[PDB]
Amino acid sequence: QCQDVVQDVPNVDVQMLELYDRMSFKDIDGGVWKQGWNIKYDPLKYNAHHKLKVFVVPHSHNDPGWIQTFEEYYQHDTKHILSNALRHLHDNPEMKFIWAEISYFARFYHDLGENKKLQMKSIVKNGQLEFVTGGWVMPDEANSHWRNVLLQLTEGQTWLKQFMNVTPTASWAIDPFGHSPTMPYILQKSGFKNMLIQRTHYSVKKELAQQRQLEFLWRQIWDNKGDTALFTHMMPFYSYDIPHTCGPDPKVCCQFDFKRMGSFGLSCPWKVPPRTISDQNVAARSDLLVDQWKKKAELYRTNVLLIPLGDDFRFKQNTEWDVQRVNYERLFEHINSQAHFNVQAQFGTLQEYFDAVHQAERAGQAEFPTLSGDFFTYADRSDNYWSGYYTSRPYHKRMDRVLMHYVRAAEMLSAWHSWDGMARIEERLEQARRELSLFQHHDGITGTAKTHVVVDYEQRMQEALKACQMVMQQSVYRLLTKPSIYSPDFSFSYFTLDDSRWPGSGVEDSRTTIILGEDILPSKHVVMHNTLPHWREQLVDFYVSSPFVSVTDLANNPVEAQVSPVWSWHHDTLTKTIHPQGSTTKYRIIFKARVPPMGLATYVLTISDSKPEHTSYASNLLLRKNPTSLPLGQYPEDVKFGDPREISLRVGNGPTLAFSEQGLLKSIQLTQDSPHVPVHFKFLKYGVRSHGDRSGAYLFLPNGPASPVELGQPVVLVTKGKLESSVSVGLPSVVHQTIMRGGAPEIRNLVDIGSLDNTEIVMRLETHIDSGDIFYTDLNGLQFIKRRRLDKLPLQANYYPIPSGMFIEDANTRLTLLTGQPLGGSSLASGELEIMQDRRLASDDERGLGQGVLDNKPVLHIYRLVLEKVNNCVRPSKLHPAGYLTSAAHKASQSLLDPLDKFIFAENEWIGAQGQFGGDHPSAREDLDVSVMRRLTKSSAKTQRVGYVLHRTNLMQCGTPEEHTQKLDVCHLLPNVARCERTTLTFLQNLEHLDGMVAPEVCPMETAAYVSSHSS
Ligand SMILES: *[C@@H]1O[C@H](CO)[C@@H](O)[C@H](O)[C@H]1NC(C)=O
Ligand SMILES: O[C@H]1[C@@H]2[C@@H](O)CCC[S@+]2C[C@H]1O
């Protein structure tokens, strides 16, 4: 049956948390290998019957945006690299080249004439040009959500299958800033057999090198059996550039980068230039180079050695192709003909290297270790830990998650039907997928690009959001209109999307008010979509032009609603206070929408001349000294005023929250009898060093622990309603909001760091929880990994990515913070959680970006806070490296990442309107998600095909019986199923033809893909 992911601790040779506890992390000078040691080898190791096989693998790192935009790099550099690669590989049959970034390759190939397309296909087919990974990008591994890692991988590999007829099975990840086990998870489920990584902490490289553990079978932290394992090669040295890839001595290796002799504007910082290889020097030059190779080979277990040959945007000029190729050819001729070296060296590809490694393994020459864990937080040297980019450019980090959801929703909503080409559905979805995929680049979501490049990514993402909205609203109109009435104009807006959290109140006033009135329009239809495969009820809100509005379902059943004011916060430069103003012409109406699995539900908003029977009105209390009046137009309850004071609130039967006089949480009481548990929010600031290394987009180099933000006497606004209550406070740089709807609170921070240079703003939670040095953070929204704070490491080393959540716990109590955006965070003392909100840095951090981070803009960060008793939960043992969410924390995460979508009908009357879609869809167990639903065929295909990605998480058992659900068989969601197949996660290979055309559900922590085929 399924593997147990909780109770059995895997036995692995290397467990990265255990390794971290034992390592000392001393930064001593190792000689020419500055972070290693002087490698020694026995010359007699190699001989006539046991040669060293060397693969020199030419490559070119092409960032899809960084210090230029994608299109700028394409025009100035990448199109010439690819054009000249085609020519030089064509003309030089033993030369090889690998290529990773399919965004660029697709941009290139589609501009080729057919003669050149054919020539390109021939050098791919014959193995000279080899694709590695084949994703749209080489993604960030820290901030990216696994769903978007899969999206971009699929975008690139689907392109490659269609146009190049190849599917890579080896991955190349030389530049992401630390590495995640989510990558082998996805890759192994996508047909891969091997992967390569580079940017791991220098101390880890030393430790694993000493044990010859740089090649390993990387399995997931919970995986007892090993079925998730993927063979992984970690490169051993400081960079992927030629000085750090031939061997341990960069002064020697630089002499073999033949672009550095002067005419190209490059040189060797170790002050010994390359020399052109001639018959007079080739023996000496070869003895230098072979000795470097044999030292590198000592770090690995086979007689097969990988030597990358490349750097950023290399292999551009024809003269560069020639100078590298001709000099290496002279070296190979000499080396391979001189028996005393016992070396056979050649240009090769990545797959060629791995195939030869595994041939050695099968011949019994090596056994590889098993490994679990991750490779965060990266440091490349000294105390320079790359935890800054977990937060840099947080606006765009948040935008990533918004677009993630709208791509899912657009693909799902439109998959139910086949569309005519004139509807431009496929066109808009392809654009949306590609812009989101581009942003997964390790200079996109990471916030490590130049200002104008960030603007380009943002503009692309905005176009993608508009594309999603168009597809979604067309789809809703089709799904909810009587078929014989449906008369679409595929350019028309039948609905507009309403999003309450993006860009957010205080960031952009982009929401449309529903305008009702006796002399204009009595009522309005709205529609909610639920992308999750279970019934959901959730409060939804809209802006309306009257407070006298009531809600009905499309059976005209009244729905209870609450009306509240529309409050906006202002930085009053004449009074020097931050305080709220209420609208006198628009109001918020809130009600519970109940929406089928993967379905839609319609409601109607109707105006009346007076308070309606089933609509209540929130009270409002402004706490501040010196108040002034707050008129609210027709809102029927007058605002109350008071001096600052502690307050407590409870919605429904839910928790009771107590707040300080400054508007910040102080305690949570779960039930009426129970203790008021201390849970205190605090905002603090980190600065920058005034000597030594400065923080920048990549690096976090604080000048000591954080200092509290001075709050003064902030203005606090309390809104109390039957359905929703909140406490909001205007603090320096942050409008902080705690919202209660009857379960776990929601936190919203409108963060505007303003002109506070050299400041990082952190939000900290202080509790009594006896967590010691342990805390948990997620990896890519997929899994939670145990962290241990290490006081032998500096503060910034104890920061980890928080892509979706974090928690601390003791024997009895857990506090989980779920996020709607990836940010950096830690637990720096027992009972604490902290998460960075924004950072503004005036200096560059000396990694090549050439600017600090001075382009901050207001961002609305969102969270859920879940305090729980966990003493009755079945948790992993103390030695297990994973943790798992409870039901309530998982649902709270889903609330943030995949909320209901809201649609407002744009015209005055919707003729043929229907009340619901998907009432017959199965309501699957809470731990299962349909992560992807995508129609894979256009309308001309006689056999339509729909793909599904199913993911089951693992939730802790805590004694909530929580049961009766329906089985979900995705292959029967559409009618006329003729076949159901299990596929790789990219949909590109059929793995099993399924009996009865039934797609089984998956095991906890597993992800599977299915394709259903339909004959009508
Ligand atoms: C793709 O490759 C397979 C074997 O590599 C070959 O049989 C086939 O003709 C190619 N199909 C295409 C070009 O779609
Ligand atoms: O962000 C950049 C990388 C970083 O490692 C700094 C050195 C250049 S690489 C190219 C970019 O992706």
Ligand SMILES: [Zn+2]
């Ligand atoms: Zn890069």
